[PDB]
Symmetry: C2
Subunit: 534 residues, 2 copies
């Protein structure tokens, strides 16, 4: 029991696991956060390092205006013919009868290399997957989205051959599997093992009814027979289990001939005044990735320890490989590139949003649109990856009107965030303001204004997260800290609290500057510290 | 002679009227509909023709992903120094505490010429206006948006000098006016008349409390004194008046030294089960533009006939100039340019959404995203401009899967529309289906499927609008029509029915093709007929 779940903490959903020789890769979805797709690398399945974010250019991923939790849904990473293949989606509509979005293919020699320009596959449903058949043929699988009023929206798993020569889907698509009574059949993955094709799918939806089902056929077009103890992964029946929403799985065979299953999961905070059987809880870290061990019997896989998953799982018999950290606890912005754990919303980090060279050893952000804007935000943020942490920054900002503000933000989506910002008041001058957006209801709860003396070069801003609650603090000298006595609920930044059709990310913390007057006033952030605690 | 109001019927709001010599122009807002800004031209203020749509390029106007009723809000058209100046906005956020949006300036020698690339002015609030002072200086006015929780969001009218040489606002902005108790102060227009600067604003919001207020100052930065009988325009007090939502005005002095006021208005449909004093009604034609006559007294203008406005208004002493129609009652798509009364949502009409040359004498639309998408819709549409009309098209479409559909659509926004479309059913083949989106609640009300025989070349589709109700009909031969006995309420496509922070357009009817499978299957529309009635 040396794998400790979750292996990817914080917002890291929809894992697509992939072996190349003795290297293991896992791609996860990133939704509106840019650059798109996170690929992690491991030798032993115990330790994982963030290795690449493939979708770096607007020609590969153009998400300006995308709805919250649109963009890059579950991706599929594979390897064949000396190349990585990455299938991804750009979902443009996440609410209502339709689910408009398009599926694309890019390739690369190495996951951290330059990925190709996208090949357009289809638009008929999300969760596309690329299957490399033993014959050399290639097939794309995806769910079929049905908009029609009388029908369940999940109309089955479609299969269609992909022509490498023609760079397009060919022939006609075929519905090969219609799911089980759990329904919401999605996330198709095909595997050829022994004498059967195994079709792995997610069912039940990505909330607390989530499950992984598997079916098998001697022929790729079916009919598929469902596992006799289906589902193979699910925590639906065990509301007290520490792993919840267990589903959307992918399977890997190690180079040591052992079998493992990656799946997403959530770790909810519960309410003491509610029944955990009725209110399963809220997940501010979003959906995380866990790894289970498989065993085989009668040609069917089973999750070792039970289908709800285990926190501690027997690691494969592989030499341990620990990686060095890929971020520093205190980022002083001495590098010319933004650290790989930082992302921006929807669009690339360019000189129109910020600079790492205009003000050396600072991250300079030019004030753009407000935190409610799905277009151009000067906001650089990183995931909450623990229930217990501190994040801190120091900002030089001299606003001249009330429409300019910059500071520290905890953020779920454009309707759900809190921010501690240096702004300007017509009567008191530079002030420190607390802003709260809760499903688009806006409040500024401080009862008395915090005036910033003109002598203060840098305003130090901190958030302290203690599982259920978090609090902001500030200092004018980094020595004497003052806590703002407004206790914020972490569950308000969770998948399970926010309204609307897209609820698939997780809480972020970061640095931000807005100027809704038009002057693009810069804020200079001296450092960003993110430190997990006990 | 008589001006008959509204002079611009259907969705034509926020009029900015402008005289150049003996020609008169009026620009109106277009929100998410592309190309942006409609400019109308008149000689006599009675007859108006659609003359230009300036914002034709994505470099001038990039609205992909824009929210419904974002985009081009109220524009400002002026003329000075031998060129037209157009100030416009691109609003990116229409709900919540902020109103993120940016204001731009483009210029041209003629309203239908090539307009420049935009100069960015500011982002501090919408309704920007450019004022040409007698001193030669230029000033930009706009409202100030206040997001702060404790404050009214309409924080006053800002003034700042614009440097023509430096292509930017210079100096610092000054709040010159904070409004009256009606509040929601917006739409500033400045006029220097006689001994005073006159600041015209809209107040009360663009629903049924709308008003136009006017103030004057000897000095451009104020303080402004409010009109003693303010507001000068409003129907708030008369719920039965045929013109409602009267406000957002602009003033013109004719070359015959007469004074007129253009303003937006709505013409509501009422419910017989409700009090009009409680439910003023619903406006499927959206906000239209009307023109009132002004008279002066003691240095203040007054609307002739009362501040609620008149339907028939005395025309200026100008020789009549009647224009011929600018669209064809039956458009056969024989021309290589889409007629000027057709618009697309958000984006240019390019070879990726349709073509007038691939299939001659047809409008070919490549199936793209559904009607609920704010991104790429292959939808070509024109305004409802009468309470009584018929629209009709004929479509060649051969869908192969249930994710392909094309046909005739009546549309307010991405959440509010109805469509009669040729689609495909796995068991019955090509079928005719009715789809309904009502504030994003989706229904398909036909009780039995309408099967289309394989031999049918064109499916003819028609909508008949009779004020409160509209009904779809279809034919397989253009001779024998079958009405679909599902009565639709016109008020469901109105500013006053749809949910959300943006409710600023009006009902459209048009041709559409979607392919949510990825194959971009084309539908070919043979013609589009739009034929109004006189009640």
């Amino acid at each position: 029991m040396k794998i400790t779940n979750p292996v990817l903490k914080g917002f890291n959903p929809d894992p697509s696991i992939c072996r190349v020789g003795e290297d293991y890769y896992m791609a996860v979805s990133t939704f509106e956060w840019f650059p798109g797709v996170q690929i992690y690398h491991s030798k032993d399945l115990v330790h994982w390092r963030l290795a690449a974010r493939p979708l770096q250019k607007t020609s590969q991923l153009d998400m300006k205006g995308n709805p919250d939790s649109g963009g890059v849904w579950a991706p599929c990473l594979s390897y064949a013919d000396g190349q990585f293949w990455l299938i991804y989606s750009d979902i443009k509509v996440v609410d209502g009868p339709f689910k408009d979005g398009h599926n694309y293919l890019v390739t690369a020699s190495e996951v951290d290399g330059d990925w190709s320009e996208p090949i357009l596959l289809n638009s008929s449903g999300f969760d596309p997957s690329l299957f490399h058949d033993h014959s050399g043929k290639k097939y794309v699988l995806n769910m079929l989205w049905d908009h029609r009023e009388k029908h369940h929206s999940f109309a089955g798993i479609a299969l269609q051959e992909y022509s490498v020569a023609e760079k397009k889907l060919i022939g006609q698509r075929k519905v090969i599997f219609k799911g089980t009574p759990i329904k919401l059949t999605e996330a198709p993955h095909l595997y050829h093992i022994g004498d059967y094709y195994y079709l792995l799918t997610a069912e039940g939806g990505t909330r607390y009814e989530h499950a992984a089902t598997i079916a098998r056929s001697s022929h790729i077009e079916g009919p598929y027979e469902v596992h006799p103890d289906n589902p193979i992964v699910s925590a639906f029946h065990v509301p007290e289990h520490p792993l919840q929403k267990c589903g959307h799985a992918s399977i890997v065979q190690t180079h040591t001939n052992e079998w493992y299953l990656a799946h997403l999961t959530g770790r909810p905070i519960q309410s003491s005044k509610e029944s955990i059987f009725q209110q399963r809880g809220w997940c501010p870290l979003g959906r995380e990735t866990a790894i289970q061990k498989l065993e085989w019997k009668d040609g069917w896989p089973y999750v070792v320890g039970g289908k709800e998953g285990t926190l501690e799982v027997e690691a494969p018999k592989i030499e341990e490989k620990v990686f060095a950290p890929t971020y520093h606890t205190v980022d002083e912005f001495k590098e010319s590139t933004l650290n790989r754990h930082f992302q921006t919303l929807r669009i690339p980090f360019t000189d129109q949003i910020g600079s790492l060279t205009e003000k050396p050893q600072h991250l300079r952000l030019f004030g753009r649109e407000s935190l409610t804007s799905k277009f151009t935000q000067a906001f650089v943020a990183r995931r909450w990856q623990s229930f217990y942490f501190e994040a801190e920054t120091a900002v030089s900002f001299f606003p001249e009107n009330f429409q300019q503000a910059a500071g520290l933000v905890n953020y779920y989506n454009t309707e759900n965030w809190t921010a501690l910002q240096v702004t300007y008041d017509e009567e008191l001058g530079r002030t420190l303001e607390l802003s709260v957006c809760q499903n688009l209801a806006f409040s500024q709860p401080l009862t008395h204004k915090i005036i910033i003396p003109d002598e203060v070069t840098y305003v130090y801003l901190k958030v302290t997260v203690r599982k259920e609650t978090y609090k902001y603090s500030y200092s004018f000298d980094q020595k004497e800290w003052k806590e703002i006595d407004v206790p914020f609920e972490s569950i308000h930044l969770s998948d399970d609290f926010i309204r609307g059709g897209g609820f698939f990310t997780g809480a972020f913390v970061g640095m931000q500057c807005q100027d809704t007057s038009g002057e693009r006033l810069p804020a200079d952030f001296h450092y960003f510290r993110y430190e997990e605690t006990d």
